[PDB]
Amino acid sequence: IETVPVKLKPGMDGPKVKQWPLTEEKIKALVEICTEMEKEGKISKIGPENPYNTPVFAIKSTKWRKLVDFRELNKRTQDFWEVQLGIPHPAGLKKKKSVTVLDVGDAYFSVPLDEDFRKYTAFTIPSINNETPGIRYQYNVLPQGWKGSPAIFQSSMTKILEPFRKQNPDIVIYQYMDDLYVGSDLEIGQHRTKIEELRQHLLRWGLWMGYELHPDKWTVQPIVLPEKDSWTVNDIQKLVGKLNWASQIYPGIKVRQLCKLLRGTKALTEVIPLTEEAELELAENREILKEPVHGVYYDPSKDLIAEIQKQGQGQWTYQIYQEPFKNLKTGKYATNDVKQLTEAVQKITTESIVIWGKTPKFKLPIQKETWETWWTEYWQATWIPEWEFVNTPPLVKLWYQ
Amino acid sequence: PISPIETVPVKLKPGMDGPKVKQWPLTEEKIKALVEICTEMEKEGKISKIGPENPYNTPVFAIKTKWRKLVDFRELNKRTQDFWEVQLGIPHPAGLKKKKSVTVLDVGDAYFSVPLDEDFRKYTAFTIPSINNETPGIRYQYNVLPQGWKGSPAIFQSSMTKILEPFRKQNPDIVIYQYMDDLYVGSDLEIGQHRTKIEELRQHLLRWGLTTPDKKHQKEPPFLWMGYELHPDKWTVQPIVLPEKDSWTVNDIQKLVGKLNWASQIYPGIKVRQLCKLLRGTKALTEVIPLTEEAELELAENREILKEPVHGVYYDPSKDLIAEIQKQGQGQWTYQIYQEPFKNLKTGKYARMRGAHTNDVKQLTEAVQKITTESIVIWGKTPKFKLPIQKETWETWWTEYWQATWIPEWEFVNTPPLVKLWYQLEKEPIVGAETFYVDGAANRETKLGKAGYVTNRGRQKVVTLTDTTNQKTELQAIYLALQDSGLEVNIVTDSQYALGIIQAQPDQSESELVNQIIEQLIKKEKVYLAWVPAHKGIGGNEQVDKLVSAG
Ligand SMILES: Cc1cc(C#N)cc(C)c1Oc1nc(Nc2ccc(C#N)cc2)nc(N)c1Br
C-alpha cells in the first residue's frame, strides 16, 4: 500500500532509551527471530547515524516471542495515535457477559511504515559481556507495540470486521494495541463459536486470565469491617482509623459514636462493650462501603493511576484512581512475589483497558531493580504499562482487608 | 589507504547550517608546517583543494618533537547530528573464555582510512592562512574521517564491524574484540596455525583499506588490557602499589580508594569505608588528612590482602556460577563468584545504604540483586547464591514484610556473621504490659518541642526539647516510652512516619535517635506498636496531646 505519513511534529525528539541486560537465551531467541524478520523485509540493519533506541526483550508457552518497549515512542507520538487517528472506546464493552482477547498484531507486519518515521523504531540486540557491538535494526513495517500501528490500520481493521459486525450487531469489538477485544452477552458455547467464526474472517486477510473475561461479574472489593462478638480497645482503634480513613473517600461515614467508646486512658487488651448507637453506626457504614463511591467519575483527560499492596500469603489488593484516594475501582488478586505481582499487573491492566480504553500508571511495591531483572520472565502481554516504584505506607495495607 | 566500504550519511542538526568560523592569522612556522602536512595528506587523498564558493570554514592550528595538525571542530560538532553510542560497555575478564594464543593488532591512521559522506565533506572545509592574512588562503576539505569530529568514533566502528562481518562468519573458531584503533584477537590454535589465521585477517583488512603492523611487530603474554593483566588461562589487575606516606592529602586518599576499589575485582575482602569517611567535608585536594585509628586499621588489612598476588579464572560456559556473600562489617558486604570451589572468576564488594534506615536482611537482598544484574551482564546468566542467612530467617522476613522481595536459587552457608533480624514486633497487643500513649509537638517557629506520654497505669512524663521538628518529637516520645518502660510494652502513636520506620525492623540508621530506639527494642522481650489518628479525641491520644501542647 501507500504509507500514512507520521509525525512527532513539535520539539519532542525521538527515543534514546538504554537497553536493559538480557540473559543468554533471550538474546539468542532474539537473533533467531530477527534474522527471519530481516529476511522477510520487516526490519533492516541500521548504521550509527541512528541515535534512537528503544529496548527489546523476549517472552514466552513453548515458542519465544519478541517484545519491544515503545513506551517512550508512544509517549512522544501521542498527538497522532490519540487526536489525529483515535480509536473510540466503547462504553458497552464492560457490560458484556463474556469478553475474549485475540492477538491480531501479525496484521501490522503487512502494512509498511512511513519511510521518514522508520528511524525512530531503532532497537539493539546486545551481547554477552559486551564482546561484540550489538546488532542494530529498525522497522520497515508497522511494529507491534507502538500505539501508532493500530491507529493506521484501523481503516483496514474496519473493512475486515464489516461483515461480522453487520451479521452480529450485538457483538462489540474493540481494538487495543495488538489485541482485539470481543464482547457478547451470548451463552458461552455460542460466544465461543462466534469467536472461531471471527477468527476465520481474519484468517482470510492474514491471521492469570484463563480463557475469556467476564466483565458483568466485576464487582469492587468493599472495605470490610470485621464482625465481632467481642471488642478490645485495640480493635476499636483499628476500627476508628480504618473508618476515619474511609471518610475521606466515602461521603456519609460517621465515627463519633465509637470515639465515645474510647473514653479515658486505657489498656489495649481491655475489652469494652458495644453501644446502641455504636453498633447502629457500624452497620450504617458497612452499608456505605459496599456500594461504590458517590462523587467519583472518570475524566478522560487525566491519567489513570493504580496502586497495589502485598497482603501476605499470595494475596494482593489494588486501587485505580485518578485523584488520590477517590477510587474508581478497587480489587483483589489471588508461587513467588514477582511472578504474582506481574500477574496482578497484567490483570489490572486488562480490566483497565476494557473499562476506559487506557492503561494505568502503576505504583509498584518492589525494588526497581528486582522488578527490572525479573519482570520479563513471567510477563505474557504485548503491551507494557507505565510504572514507578513506591514504598507501600503500612497503614493503607491494613485499611484494605 | 581509504577503504572502499560505502559511506555513512550524515547530516547537521535540523535547525542548523554548517559552521563559518574565522581563521585566526597564524605564525609562519605554523603556516609552513600546515602547508607541509596538508600537501602530503592531499597526495594520499585525505583532503582535496577547493574554491571560495564553498562558504564553510573551521580553524586549523599546529602544535609541536615534530609538527601536528590540530583542527577545532567545536562548532561543527555542536552543529552535527547526534549518533549512537559506540560501545554500551566493556567486557570483563571474568566473562572471557581462556585462549591458547592471542595477538593484538593496531590499525594505522584509522580515521584517515575511512571515507566521509560526500554530501558532508563540504562542511569540513578549513583554511591555511597566508603570511599576515594579506592574501587568500589555501582551502581544503576532508574526504575522510577527521580527527576530533563528533562522528569519527562511531562511523569508524561501524565500518570496521561491517568489514569484519564476513571474516568472523568464515572463522567461527577465532575471536576478535574491536576497541578503537585496536583489534584484539585470540584462538585456541597453536602458535603457527594461529599466526597464519592472523595473516588471513591482515590481508583481509588490507583488502578493505586498513593497514596494520608487520608479522613480527606484535606482543606476547602477559597482555595489559584496560587495567587488567591478562594471561592465557588466568587474569588479575595491573599491578597495584599502595604508597607509604607519612602525610595523606585528599588527592592521595582519593587515588587510593580508586586503586583499592579497582583492586576489589579480584582481591577478596578489600574494604574502603573508613578511608572514605575521611573524604566527607569539602577540603582542598592538597589538604592533609590525619588518619584515624580505624582508617589505619583498615589500610593495613588491605595491605595484607595485597602483599601476595591473587589471580582469577576465566569462564566456562558449561558449568554453573556460584556466588557467595559475606557480611564483613556494618553496611559492608563482600562476595566472590566462582564455578569450581575457590577458583574465583571475580570478587567484589557492596556497601550501600538505600534510604535512611535499613536492616541486614534488606541489605543482603540488595546485595543479591546487584550481583544478579552484574551476572546477567558478564555471563548472561544468574548464579546460585550461597548466603549467610537461615532459610527460616528469610522466610519470616519476606512473608511479613510489605515490599515484594524475591531472590533466586540459594542456600544457607554457615559463614558468620549470620544475617538475623534482631527484634520482632508483636502482632497482637500484650496483656499485663503497660500501654504508653505517646505524642510529640513542636512549634514550627520557636522550634522548641515537647515529647511525652501517658499510660493506662497512670504514669505521665513530658520532657522539653529544643531545636527539633514534629518528626523528631514523635520519635523522642517513643524513645521515652521504651526507656521508662518494662520488658513488655504496648505503645500507641499518631505518627504514621514513626510506625513506618519501626515497623520495618531497622537495625541500622542514619539518625542517632533511631539508633537509640533500636537499642531499646533489642533489650525488650515484647513490643507491640499501634497507630491512631491524631486529634480525633481518642481515649489517651487526647490526654497526651493536651500535656504536650504548650509551646
Ligand atoms: C582476544 C582478546 C585479547 C585481549 C587482550 N589483550 C582482550 C580481549 C577482550 C580479547 O577478547 C577476548 N578474549 C577472551 N579471552 C582471553 C583469554 C586469554 C587472554 C590472554 N592472555 C586474553 C583474552 N575471550 C573473548 N571472548 C574475547 Br572477545
CATH number for the domain harbouring residue B444: 3.30.420.10
Cβ–Cβ gap A237/B538 under 8 Å: yes
Chain B contact set for A340 (CB, 8 A): 404
Cβ–Cβ gap B381/A23 under 8 Å: yes
Q: CA-based angle A288:A290:A294, to the nearest 5?
A: 55
B187 in helix, strand or coil?
Answer: strand
CA distance to partner chain B, nearest, from residue A97 (Å) = 34
Q: How far apart are CA A289 and CA B424, in angstroms?
A: 34
Give B297's DSSP letter: H
B10 in the same domain as B142: yes
Q: Do domains A1-83+109-149 and A321-399 have the same CATH topology?
A: no
Method: X-ray
In the sheet with B526-531, reading across from the earlier edge strand, the strands are B460-465, B449-455, B434-442, B488-493, B526-531
Residues with Cβ within 8 Å of residue B172, at least 6 apart in sequence: none
Give yes or no for a contact between B228 and B237, defined as CB atoms under 8 angstroms apart: yes
Give yes or no for a contact between B283 and B253, defined as CB atoms under 8 angstroms apart: no
Chain B contact set for A53 (CB, 8 A): 84
Give yes or no for a contact between B268 and B306, defined as CB atoms under 8 angstroms apart: no
CA distance to partner chain B, nearest, from residue A20 (Å) = 9
B321 in the same domain as B298: no
Q: Whose alpha carbon is nearest atom 11 of ligand 1?
A: B177
B346 in the same domain as B259: no
Identify the H or E element spanning B140: strand B138-142
Helices B360-379 and B391-400 pack at an angle, to 10 degrees, of 100
Q: How far apart are CA B469 and CA B58, in angstroms?
A: 60
Which amino acid is residue A109, in one-letter code?
F
SS (H, E, C) chain A: CCCCCCCCCCCCCCCECCCCCCCHHHHHHHHHHHHHHHHCCCEEECCCCCCCEECEEEECCCCCEEEECCHHHHHHCHHHHHHHCCCCCCHHHHHCCEEEEEECHHHHHCCECCCCCHHHHCEEECCHHHCCCCEEEEECECCCCCCHHHHHHHHHHHHHHHHHHHHCCCCEEEEECCEEEEEECCCHHHHHHHHHHHHHHHHCCCCCCCCCECHHHCCCCCCCCCCCCCCEHHHHHHHHHHHHHHHCCCCCCCCHHHHHHCCCCCCCCCECCCCHHHHHHHHHHHHHHHCCCCCCCCCCCCCCEEEEEEEECCEEEEEEECCCCCEEEEEEECCCHHHHHHHHHHHHHHHHHHHHCCCCEEEECECHHHHHHHHHHCCCCCCCCCEEECCCCHHHHHHCC
Give yes or no for a contact between B529 and B491, defined as CB atoms under 8 angstroms apart: yes
Cα-to-centroid distance, A40 and ligand 1 (Å): 36
Chain A contact set for B366 (CB, 8 A): 367
SS (H, E, C) B340-392: CCCCEEEEEEECCCCCCEECHHHHHHHHHHHHHHHHHHHHCCCCEEEECECHH
Q: CA-based angle B258:B260:B263, to the nearest 5?
A: 110
Annotated domain spans of chain A:
1-83+109-149, 84-108+150-215, 216-320, 321-399
Give yes or no for a contact between B384 and B371, defined as CB atoms under 8 angstroms apart: no
| Burial class of residue A19 in the structure, from the number of CB atoms within 10 Å of its CB (0-12 exposed, 13-18 middle, 19+ buried) | middle
Say if B88 is an interface residue toward chain A (CB within 8 Å): yes
CA torsion through residues A20, A26, A28, A30, sign: negative
Give B133's DSSP letter: G
Identify which of B397, B407, B272 has the alpha carbon closest to the alpha carbon of residue B329.
Answer: B272
Give yes or no for a contact between B369 and A370, defined as CB atoms under 8 angstroms apart: yes
B539 in the same domain as B500: yes
Total residue count of chain B as it appears in this document: 551
Assigned superfamily of A1-83+109-149: HIV Type 1 Reverse Transcriptase, subunit A, domain 1 (3.10.10.10)
Q: How far apart are CA A377 and CA B166, in angstroms?
A: 34
Chain B contact set for A389 (CB, 8 A): none
Q: Which atom of ligand 1 is nearest to the CA of B225?
A: 6
Identify which of A144, A30, A143, A58 has the alpha carbon closest to the alpha carbon of residue A379.
Answer: A58
Identify which of B419, B332, B413, B321 has the alpha carbon closest to the alpha carbon of residue B371.
Answer: B321
**Grid cell in block for residue A217:** 461479574
Q: How far apart are CA A198 and CA B201, in angstroms?
A: 58
Residue B116 belongs to domain with CATH number: 3.10.10.10
The best mutation among B92, B96, B313 to test binding of ligand 1, ranked by most ligand atoms within 8 Å of the C-beta, falls on B96
Q: CA-based angle A244:A247:A253, to the nearest 5?
A: 100
Write down the residue that cell numbers 580508586 correspond to: B258
B404 in the same domain as B371: yes
**Grid cell in block for residue B341:** 570451589
Residue B270 belongs to domain with CATH number: 3.30.70.270
Which amino acid is residue B359, in one-letter code?
N
**Grid cell in block for residue A283:** 452497620
Give B419's DSSP letter: B
| Burial class of residue B181 in the structure, from the number of CB atoms within 10 Å of its CB (0-12 exposed, 13-18 middle, 19+ buried) | middle
CA–chain centroid gap for B69, Å, is: 36
B249 in the same domain as B196: no
SS (H, E, C) A317-334: EEEEECCCCCEEEEEEEC
**Grid cell in block for residue A2:** 501507500
Identify the H or E element spanning B145: none
CA–chain centroid gap for B194, Å, is: 37
Give yes or no for a contact between B178 and B205, defined as CB atoms under 8 angstroms apart: no
User: Which A residues, 254 through 273, put their C-beta within 8 Å of a C-beta on chain B?
Assistant: 255, 259, 262-270
Cβ–Cβ gap A394/B496 under 8 Å: yes
**Grid cell in block for residue B407:** 531472590
Say if A370 is an interface residue toward chain B (CB within 8 Å): yes
User: Strand A387-389 relative to strand A361-364: parallel, antiparallel, unpaired?
Assistant: parallel
Chain B contact set for A238 (CB, 8 A): 530
Cβ–Cβ gap A309/B402 under 8 Å: yes
Identify the H or E element spanning B513: helix B512-523
**Grid cell in block for residue B549:** 501542647
Identify which of B472, B477, B470, B507 has the alpha carbon closest to the alpha carbon of residue B491.
Answer: B477
Which option is the CATH number for A84-108+150-215: 3.30.70.270, 3.90.660.10, 3.30.465.10, 3.20.20.450? 3.30.70.270
Q: From residue B147, how far is each of A33, B74, B109, B123, B139 by CA, in Å?
A: 38, 12, 10, 14, 18
Q: How far apart are CA A42 and CA A113, in angstroms?
A: 10
Closest residue of B to A131, CA-based?
B91
Q: From residue B208, how far is each of A206, A299, B162 by CA, in Å?
A: 45, 62, 10
Identify the H or E element spanning B492: strand B488-493
Please state, as a whole number, how many other Cβ atoms lie within 10 Å of the Cβ of residue B547.
Answer: 18
B383 in the same domain as B305: no
B458 in the same domain as B529: yes
Identify which of A273, A267, A241, A243 has the alpha carbon closest to the alpha carbon of residue B437.
Answer: A267
Residues in a beta bridge with B436: B455, B491
Which DSSP string do the residues of B423-466 spell out, in sequence order? ----SSPPTTSEEEEEEEEE-TTT--EEEEEEETTS-EEEEEES
Give yes or no for a contact between B463 and B472, defined as CB atoms under 8 angstroms apart: no
The experimental resolution of this structure, in angstroms, equals 2.7
Give yes or no for a contact between B2 and B111, defined as CB atoms under 8 angstroms apart: no
User: Strand B344-350 relative to strand A361-364: parallel, antiparallel, unpaired?
Assistant: unpaired
Q: CA-based angle A316:A322:A324, to the nearest 5?
A: 70
Q: How far apart are CA B530 and CA B145, in angstroms?
A: 70
Give the nearest partner residue to B369 out of A131, A268, A369, using CB atoms: A369
Give yes or no for a contact between B76 and A116, defined as CB atoms under 8 angstroms apart: no
**Grid cell in block for residue B144:** 575522510
Total residue count of chain A as it appears in this document: 401
CA torsion through residues B132, B133, B134, B138, sign: positive
Residues in a beta bridge with B332: B329
| Burial class of residue B122 in the structure, from the number of CB atoms within 10 Å of its CB (0-12 exposed, 13-18 middle, 19+ buried) | middle
- Compute the radius of gyration of chain A from its Cα atoms: 25
Identify which of B266, B286, B288, B261 has the alpha carbon closest to the alpha carbon of residue B276.
Answer: B261
Q: How far apart are CA A221 and CA B93, in angstroms?
A: 54
Write down the residue that cell numbers 480490566 correspond to: A351
Helices A276-290 and A233-247 pack at an angle, to 10 degrees, of 40
B137 in the same domain as B26: yes
Q: How far apart are CA B531 and CA B536, in angstroms?
A: 12
Q: Which of B152, B228, B406, B426 to mutate to test the interface with A (most CBs of A within 10 A)?
A: B406
B153 in helix, strand or coil?
Answer: helix
Q: Of B176, B199, B221, which residue constitutes the final position of a domain?
A: B221
Residues with Cβ within 8 Å of residue A394, at least 6 apart in sequence: B402, B496, B499, B500, B503
Give the nearest partner residue to A130 out of B88, B381, B531, using CB atoms: B88
Residue B417: cis peptide before it, omega within 30 degrees of 0: yes
Q: How far apart are CA A353 and CA A345, in angstroms?
A: 12
Give yes or no for a contact between A237 and A262, defined as CB atoms under 8 angstroms apart: yes
Q: Of B280, B295, B315, which residue constitutes the final position of a domain?
A: B315
Q: Tell me the count of A-B CB pairs closer than 8 A.
A: 183
Q: How far apart are CA A367 and CA B494, in angstroms?
A: 28
Q: How far apart are CA B324 and CA B93, in angstroms?
A: 19
Q: Of B164, B195, B221, which residue constitutes the final position of a domain?
A: B221
Residues with Cβ within 8 Å of residue B143, at least 6 apart in sequence: B2, B45, B46, B47, B48, B115, B116, B121
Cα atoms found within 13 Å of the Cα of residue A146, Cβ hemisphere only: 29
Please state, as a whole number, how many other Cβ atoms lie within 10 Å of the Cβ of residue B446.
Answer: 10
B171 in the same domain as B64: no
Give the CA diameter of chain B.
Answer: 103
Give B95's DSSP letter: G
B1 in the same domain as B142: yes
Please state, as a whole number, how many other Cβ atoms lie within 10 Å of the Cβ of residue A252.
Answer: 13
Cβ–Cβ gap B536/A365 under 8 Å: no
Give yes or no for a contact between A167 and A173, defined as CB atoms under 8 angstroms apart: no
B506 in the same domain as B389: no
Number of domains in chain B: 5
Q: How far apart are CA B420 and CA B507, in angstroms?
A: 10
**Grid cell in block for residue B16:** 542548523
Chain B contact set for A270 (CB, 8 A): 456
Which amino acid is residue B198, in one-letter code?
I
Which amino acid is residue B213, in one-letter code?
P
User: Strand B434-442 relative to strand B410-412: parallel, antiparallel, unpaired?
Assistant: unpaired
User: Which A residues, 312 through 341, put their C-beta within 8 Å of a C-beta on chain B?
Assistant: 312-313, 336-338, 340-341
CA–chain centroid gap for B163, Å, is: 32
Which DSSP string do the residues of B47-83 spell out, in sequence order? EEE--SSS--BB-EEEE----EEEE--HHHHHTB---
* Residues near ligand 1 (Cβ within 6 A): A 131; B 91, 96-99, 102, 104, 175, 177, 184-186, 221, 223, 225, 230-232, 314
Residues in a beta bridge with B326: B334
In the sheet with B101-106, reading across from the earlier edge strand, the strands are B101-106, B182-187, B175-179
**Grid cell in block for residue B104:** 593484538
**Grid cell in block for residue B134:** 594579506
What fold, for A216-320?
Alpha-Beta Plaits (3.30.70)
Please state, as a whole number, how many other Cβ atoms lie within 10 Å of the Cβ of residue A86.
Answer: 12
B121 in helix, strand or coil?
Answer: helix
What fold, for A321-399?
Alpha-Beta Plaits (3.30.70)
Which amino acid is residue A31, in one-letter code?
V
Say if B400 is an interface residue toward chain A (CB within 8 Å): yes
Helical H runs in B171-222? 191-206
Say if B514 is an interface residue toward chain A (CB within 8 Å): no
Cα atoms found within 13 Å of the Cα of residue B325, Cβ hemisphere only: 31
Say if B490 is an interface residue toward chain A (CB within 8 Å): yes
Residue B222: cis peptide before it, omega within 30 degrees of 0: yes
Cα-to-centroid distance, B452 and ligand 1 (Å): 67
Q: Which atom of ligand 1 is nearest to the CA of B179?
A: 9
Give B101's DSSP letter: E
Say if B399 is an interface residue toward chain A (CB within 8 Å): yes
Residue B190: which domain range? 87-111+153-221
Say if B547 is an interface residue toward chain A (CB within 8 Å): no
Give yes or no for a contact between B152 and B170, defined as CB atoms under 8 angstroms apart: no
Q: How far apart are the first and last CA of chain A?
A: 55
Cα atoms found within 13 Å of the Cα of residue B477, Cβ hemisphere only: 37
